[PDB]
UniProtKB/TrEMBL annotation, chain B:
Keyword tags: Ribonucleoprotein, Ribosomal protein, RNA-binding, rRNA-binding
GO molecular function: rRNA binding; structural constituent of ribosome
Protein's recorded name: Large ribosomal subunit protein bL21
Organism expressing this protein natively: Streptomyces fradiae ATCC 10745 = DSM 40063
Biological function: This protein binds to 23S rRNA in the presence of protein L20.
Keyword Zinc: no
UniProtKB/TrEMBL annotation, chain C:
GO cellular component, one term: ribosome
Statement: the UniProt record of this protein carries the keyword Ribosomal protein: yes
Keywords: Ribonucleoprotein, Ribosomal protein, RNA-binding, rRNA-binding
Family: Belongs to the bacterial ribosomal protein bL20 family.
Keyword Amino-acid biosynthesis part of the UniProt annotation: no
Protein's name in the database: Large ribosomal subunit protein bL20
Function: Binds directly to 23S ribosomal RNA and is necessary for the in vitro assembly process of the 50S ribosomal subunit. It is not involved in the protein synthesizing functions of that subunit.
Domain of life: Bacteria
GO MF: rRNA binding; structural constituent of ribosome
Organism: Streptomyces fradiae ATCC 10745 = DSM 40063
InterPro entries listed in its UniProt record: Ribosomal_bL20, RIBOSOMAL_L20_CS, Ribosomal_protein_bL20_C
Example GO BP: translation
UniProtKB/TrEMBL annotation, chain E:
Organism listed in the record: Streptomyces fradiae ATCC 10745 = DSM 40063
Cleavable signal peptide: none
Molecular function per GO: rRNA binding; structural constituent of ribosome
Record text on subunit structure and interactions: Part of the 50S ribosomal subunit.
GO terms of biological process kind: translation
Keyword Membrane among record annotations: no
Basic residues bias locations: 6-15
Name the record gives this protein: Large ribosomal subunit protein uL4
Keywords of this entry: Ribonucleoprotein, Ribosomal protein, RNA-binding, rRNA-binding
Ranges for region Disordered: 1-45
Function statement: Forms part of the polypeptide exit tunnel.
UniProtKB/TrEMBL annotation, chain F:
Family: Belongs to the bacterial ribosomal protein bL32 family.
Highest taxon of the lineage: Bacteria
The protein, known as: Large ribosomal subunit protein bL32
RNA sequence: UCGAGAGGGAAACAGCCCAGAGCAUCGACUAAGGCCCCUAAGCGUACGCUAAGUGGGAAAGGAGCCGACAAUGUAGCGGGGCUCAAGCGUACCGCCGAAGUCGUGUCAUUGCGUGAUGGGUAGGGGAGCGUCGUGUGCCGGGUGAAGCAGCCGCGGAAGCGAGUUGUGGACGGUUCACGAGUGAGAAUGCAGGCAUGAGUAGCGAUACACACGUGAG
RNA sequence: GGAGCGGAGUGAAAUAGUACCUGAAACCGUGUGCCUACAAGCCGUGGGAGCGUUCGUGACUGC
C-alpha cells in the first residue's frame, strides 16, 4: 500500500536532518508523529510536515483512511544543492561557508 | 579400481570413465585413442608396483576435447625505473576420457 | 583537427577499476590509487603463482612424512628405498594415497623397506 | 584433481598423557608441540588445527641438565619504566612448574591466531592426578625411529 | 603571445605555484602550444611523374575497355534528358567522366546537372578524376585535342 | 595542530555513529 | 656484483655466498645453506673433545677459564630450548632446498627440420593498439546511431566484439591511403565540483525580566 | 503558512516540470548476501572451510 511524499530543497543540513529521520524508521505512523512532536531538534518540524503528507496521500489518493495500520517503510534524506558564501576573517583572508540543503522522503505502507 | 598414469611429465589418478585434463597432445585429433604409461595400479588390496609388470600395462584413453584454460594476466614491474612488461597467457589443454585399464 | 581525449582515456580507466573491484577502502574507487595497487596485485600473483609449486611440495612432504612415520620409516629413507625399487611415483599422488587409501601407501612402504640396503650406514 | 584439504569433521582428536618424570624439559616441549600442532597424522594442513589434546602429569620433575636451574631466567616486562622482572628456574620450577612447561611449549608453536588455539589443548599439572579422567586419555610414550 | 592580456606576473613566499603569466599554456584560457598555423599543403611533383601517372590511369581504363568516344553529347538544343539517355546507352555504372572542350557549351550545360557525371577540359584532364570515374567519355574534338 | 592525513572512511564513520539523538 | 639484476641463503640487511627470471605447470634432480619445534628435511650411524650455555664477540697478561666493563626492556644464537648436544673435530649414509637444470606444453629473434637465443635503466631499431577528421568502395540506423552502465566471450600488449541487455533518442561501421590541437598520474600545474579536519573552533567586548497582543510558528 | 509533494491531466516520453536533451566520476544515502568485538593489518596475493540474494563474501594460514 506504499504511499509516499517528500519535501525537496528543505533548508536544513543533511546530517542534521538524518539525526531526526533515523528515529522514525519502522514505527507506527501515529507513534512516529508522537515522537517528532516531543523532539528537541529543530529539524523535527519539516520532517513531521512531510510525515503528514505521506499519511494524507495514503488516506486520499489510495483510500486507506485508517491511519493506524501504517508504519514507516522508507525514510531517507538526500543531499541537495549547496549554496556558497564567504566570511571575512583575520588579516584580510576569507573562508568559505556552505549552506547545505536536503531532500527528505518518507514512505508509509500498510502493515 | 584405479591406476596412476603419466601424461606429459605429470602424474594423475584415473579410474575407468574419468575425464582428465592433460597437456596438449598435438598429434591426436578429437576421437583418437592414446595409450598412457601406467605407474601404479590399485585394485582393492592388490597393489601392482613392479616396473617390469607395469611396463606392459598401458591405460587406454580417448581424446575428448581440445580446449584452452582460463586467461592469466602477467605483469613485470620494478619501481622508480619505469620498467613494465604486460603479457597474457592461455595454456592449451586436452581432455581425455579413460576407457580401459588392462589387468 | 582538435581531439577531445575523453572517449579514448576512459577505456583504460574502466579496465583498471574493474580489476580493482574488491579492494578495501580507497583502492577500489579512485583510478590513480587503484592503479598503483593492481600493479602490486599482478606482481604478487606472479611470485606466488610460481612459488606455490614449492608450497604444495612442502605440504606433500609433510603428509608423506607423517604417514611414513606411522609405519616406522622416516621420510629420509622411505624415499631412498623407493629410488632403489624404481617405483618412482610423484609426491603429488604419493601423498594422495596416505590420506585416502592407507593400505596402498602401507603396501608401498613395504616395498621401500625391502629395497633398502641391509645396513644403511656402511660405506657404499 | 586437487589435493585433499581437510574439512571440519575429518578430524578426530585424541587424548595423550605424557608423564614428564625426569624427562628433559626441551624434549617434552617438542614432543608436546608436535602432537598439539597435529603434525603427526596424514590429514595435516597448515591452516586447520588437527592436533590432539596433550595432558602433562609430573610437570614438576622435569630434568634440567647442567647449571640451567640457577642460570636461566624468565624475563617479563610490564610496560612501565623499570618494569622488567626475571625469575630463576630454581624458583620458577619450585612453585610454578606448570607455568614454565606451558611457556616452553608456547614458544615451540606459531605465534599467530591459530597457534594460540592449538595451545589451548595442553593441560599441565604438577601431581600424578589429572581431572580429565572422563576423556579416556591414552598414555603416550616418547620413542625414536630408525 | 597573442592571447589578450597576461602581461603581468600574477603574484610574487605565497605558498602557491610559480607563474609567469595568466595566459601560460597550462592555464585555462591560456595560449595553445604547438598549435596549428596557416600553411600551404601543395607539393612539387616532377612534371614527368605527373604525365606518366595520367598515362597509367588512362591506360588502365583502356585495358578494361572503359574509354568511349562520341561525336557529340546533344544535337541542337540543350537537354539534360538527351545527355541522360546517351550516357545510359554507354554505361550503367555509377561514376562517369566527360571530357569536352570548354567552347562546346551544349555538352557542358546538358550534362553538368547529371549527378554522376564529372566534366573536364581536354587540357585539364587529371589523374584524380580518371581514377574516380568508372568510364571516360571523350568528344571527338576533345579526343584529338588531347592526343595531339 | 593540523590533521596529518585524510581520515579513512572507516574511522570517520566510527565516530559519526556516536552523534545520534535519543528516542524520547 | 649493484648501478641496470628478479629468485634461494646470511632473522631483517642495493655491493657478501648460490644463481642470470620469454610464458604456463598441484612433476623430478640439485647449487649456496640446512635437516629437535617455530620451518621443508636426521632426536642420523661410529669414534674422540668441551662443563664454560664455550658454541652465542675481543687484547697484553695470569693460572676450555679469568682478563670482560653504560645508560627505554631479556637484548652479543632470529626465538623456544639445547651438554640424555639440538656444540666443535673426523669419516659414512640419506634427505630438504631457487624463477638453476631436466620433464611437458606454447610463443618470439636469429643462422643454416635443425643450432643458438629471448633480465634490463640511459639509449638505438622494428612491429602495432586507440581517438578525431578527409578521399574512396562496400554497408548499418525510430525494426532504435552516438554516448553511458552492466553481462558473456576474444587477443601476447596497447585493446576488441556487424555479441547481448538497460538507458538514450539521431547519427555510425569498415578496406586502402592521407592529416593530426592523436593518448597524463605527478610540473608546491590550471578551472569546476566534492571530501578530511567536524557537527569541531567561532558566533566580534557588562543586563535584561515579566504580563498581554499579533501570529501557522 | 508557503515551499514542496501524492493522485489527475498534456505530451511519443514528466527520474523531458521552466532547478528542465544525454546525465559519467569524485561525494552522500536506503535495502540487501557474506565477514567482522583475543586482534598488530603498503590493506594485496597463493592455499582454503563456511555461508548465500560460475558468481558474492572470506574464518584460518604462507608470502
Amino acid at each position: 500500500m506504499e504511499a509516499r511524499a517528500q519535501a525537496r530543497y528543505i533548508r536544513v543540513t543533511p546530517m542534521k536532518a538524518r539525526r531526526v529521520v533515523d528515529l522514525i524508521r519502522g514505527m507506527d505512523a501515529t507513534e512516529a508523529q508522537a515522537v517528532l512532536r516531543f523532539a528537541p531538534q529543530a529539524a523535527s518540524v519539516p520532517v513531521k510536515k512531510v510525515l503528514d503528507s505521506a499519511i494524507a496521500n495514503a488516506a486520499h489518493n489510495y483510500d486507506h483512511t485508517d491511519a493506524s495500520s501504517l508504519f514507516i517503510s522508507e525514510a531517507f534524506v538526500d543531499e541537495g544543492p549547496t549554496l556558497k558564501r564567504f566570511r571575512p576573517r583575520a588579516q584580510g583572508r576569507a573562508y568559505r561557508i556552505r549552506k547545505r540543503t536536503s531532500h527528505i522522503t518518507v514512505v508509509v505502507s500498510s502493515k | 579400481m584405479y591406476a596412476i598414469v603419466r601424461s606429459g611429465g605429470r602424474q594423475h589418478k584415473v579410474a575407468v570413465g574419468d575425464i582428465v585434463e592433460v597437456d596438449k597432445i598435438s598429434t591426436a585429433k578429437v576421437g583418437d585413442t592414446v595409450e598412457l604409461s601406467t605407474l601404479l595400479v590399485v585394485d582393492g588390496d592388490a597393489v601392482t608396483s613392479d616396473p617390469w609388470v607395469l611396463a606392459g600395462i598401458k591405460v587406454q584413453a580417448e581424446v575428448v576435447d581440445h580446449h584452452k584454460g582460463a586467461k592469466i594476466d602477467i605483469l613485470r614491474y620494478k619501481n622508480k625505473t619505469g620498467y613494465r612488461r604486460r603479457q597474457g597467457h592461455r595454456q592449451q589443454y586436452t581432455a581425455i576420457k579413460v576407457t580401459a585399464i588392462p589387468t | 583537427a582538435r581531439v577531445k581525449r575523453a572517449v579514448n582515456a576512459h577505456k583504460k580507466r574502466r579496465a583498471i577499476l574493474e580489476q580493482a573491484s574488491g579492494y578495501r577502502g580507497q583502492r577500489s574507487r579512485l583510478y590513480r590509487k587503484a592503479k598503483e595497487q593492481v600493479t602490486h596485485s599482478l606482481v604478487y600473483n606472479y611470485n606466488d603463482r610460481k612459488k606455490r609449486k614449492g608450497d604444495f611440495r612442502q605440504l606433500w612432504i609433510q603428509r608423506i612424512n607423517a604417514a611414513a612415520r606411522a609405519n616406522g620409516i622416516t621420510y629420509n629413507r622411505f624415499i631412498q628405498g623407493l629410488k632403489a625399487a624404481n617405483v618412482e611415483v610423484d609426491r603429488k599422488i604419493l601423498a594422495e594415497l596416505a590420506v585416502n587409501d592407507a593400505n596402498a601407501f602401507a603396501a608401498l612402504v613395504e616395498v621401500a623397506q625391502k629395497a633398502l640396503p641391509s645396513d644403511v650406514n656402511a660405506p657404499k | 584433481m586437487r589435493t585433499y584439504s581437510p574439512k571440519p569433521g575429518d578430524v578426530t582428536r585424541q587424548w595423550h598423557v605424557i608423564d614428564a618424570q625426569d624427562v628433559v624439559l626441551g624434549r617434552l616441549a617438542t614432543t608436546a608441540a608436535t602432537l598439539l600442532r597435529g603434525k603427526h597424522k596424514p590429514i595435516y594442513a597448515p591452516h586447520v588445527d588437527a592436533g590432539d589434546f596433550v595432558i602433562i602429569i609430573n610437570a614438576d620433575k622435569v630434568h634440567l641438565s647442567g647449571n640451567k636451574r640457577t642460570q636461566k631466567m624468565a624475563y617479563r616486562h610490564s610496560g612501565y619504566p623499570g618494569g622488567l622482572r626475571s625469575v630463576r628456574y630454581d624458583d620458577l620450577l619450585a612453585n610454578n612448574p606448570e607455568k614454565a612447561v606451558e611457556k616452553a611449549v608456547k614458544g615451540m608453536l606459531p605465534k599467530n591466531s591459530l597457534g594460540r588455539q592449538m595451545l589451548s589443548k595442553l593441560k599441565v599439572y604438577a601431581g600424578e592426578n589429572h581431572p580429565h579422567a572422563a576423556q579416556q586419555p591414552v598414555p603416550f610414550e616418547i620413542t625414536q625411529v630408525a | 603571445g597573442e592571447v589578450r592580456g597576461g602581461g603581468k606576473k600574477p603574484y610574487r613566499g605565497t605558498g602557491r605555484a610559480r607563474q609567469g603569466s595568466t595566459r601560460a599554456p597550462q592555464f585555462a584560457g591560456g595560449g595553445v602550444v604547438h598549435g596549428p598555423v596557416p600553411r600551404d599543403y601543395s607539393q612539387r611533383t616532377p612534371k614527368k611523374m605527373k604525365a606518366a601517372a595520367l598515362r597509367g590511369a588512362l591506360s588502365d581504363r583502356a585495358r578494361h575497355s572503359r574509354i568511349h568516344v562520341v561525336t557529340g553529347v546533344v544535337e541542337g538544343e540543350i537537354s539534360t534528358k538527351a545527355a541522360k539517355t546517351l550516357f545510359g546507352k554507354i554505361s550503367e555504372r555509377k561514376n562517369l567522366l566527360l571530357v569536352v572542350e570548354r567552347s562546346d557549351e551544349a555538352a557542358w550545360l546538358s550534362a553538368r546537372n547529371l549527378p554522376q557525371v564529372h566534366i573536364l577540359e581536354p587540357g585539364q584532364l587529371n589523374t584524380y578524376d580518371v581514377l574516380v570515374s568508372d568510364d571516360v567519355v571523350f568528344t571527338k574534338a576533345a579526343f584529338e585535342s588531347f592526343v595531339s | 595542530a593540523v590533521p596529518k592525513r585524510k581520515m579513512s572512511r572507516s574511522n570517520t564513520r566510527h565516530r559519526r555513529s556516536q552523534w545520534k539523538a535519543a528516542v524520547p
